[PDB]
Design a protein around this ligand. Structure first.
Ligand code: CA
Ligand code: CA
Ligand code: CA
Ligand code: CA
Lengths: 144, 145
């Protein structure tokens, strides 16, 4: 059914810039961190891909993007943490729950890229059709 | 036997400021990197500790502190790298090389705290006696096992 129309403009360019500045400041290291994310090999559908990613992105924002309190980046994460909560109103639940997901071991920088790409693709789609993520993904998911 | 009196002010609060910022912008994680640094246990002499650290900090700044070009942190690291070179003339060379050196498996922020700590202390001892790092540390290094 219908969802909030606000979802159409939930994600602004201010959110993506804040996200890039955050990325830019990060130091390139060999150290890899472990995190759960969507396995593309088993889930291609662009809509259902982002639909499944949104919930993993949320966890990552809360439980991995840690910055020293009151720093410019910490504030970025504040804004992103809030944005993520508002977006709950734009993603309907699908019947499953741990399939389509794999363990990723990659650089913190390569991770912050995935989050970026998510908020970007998600932004575009929502502009085009702010009911897009009400899609039924039971099958797409089940094909994993 | 002596170094330019200007070693006194070669390190400025400006250098420490850009460094603290660089540090504050780094995402806290438990990802651990491996690097060589001074083993405090085998080398606790304040002066000689820093002399040994200097070259090690040189290496780290050059090969480990990597940022995307023209980035605020990439520009700070450039300044520090320059400072590192100009500081070389303030440290007299000692004779001995892997004495007092140990591998550390720690997070980047911890590794940076070592870099910041190095500059702070080094800055202080130069403000008190700009010839301090002329000291002969052959014996302190030799004590290491
Ligand atoms: Ca797994
Ligand atoms: Ca379906
Ligand atoms: Ca004079
Ligand atoms: Ca000066």
């Amino acid at each position: 059914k219908e969802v909030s129309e606000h979802c159409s403009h939930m994600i602004g360019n201010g959110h993506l810039k804040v996200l890039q500045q955050l990325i830019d400041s990060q130091m390139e290291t060999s150290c890899q961190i472990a995190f759960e994310f969507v396995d593309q090999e088993q889930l291609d559908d662009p809509v259902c891909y982002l639909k499944k990613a949104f919930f993993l992105v949320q966890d990552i924002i809360d439980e991995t993007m840690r910055f020293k309190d009151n720093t410019p980046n910490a504030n970025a994460t504040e804004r992103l943490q809030e944005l993520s909560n508002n977006l709950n109103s734009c993603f309907t639940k699908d019947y499953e729950n741990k399939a389509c997901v794999r363990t990723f071991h990659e650089t913190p920088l390569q991770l912050l890229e995935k989050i970026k790409n998510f908020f970007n693709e998600t932004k575009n789609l929502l502009e085009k059709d702010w009911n897009i993520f009400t899609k039924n993904c039971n099958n797409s998911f089940a094909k994993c």
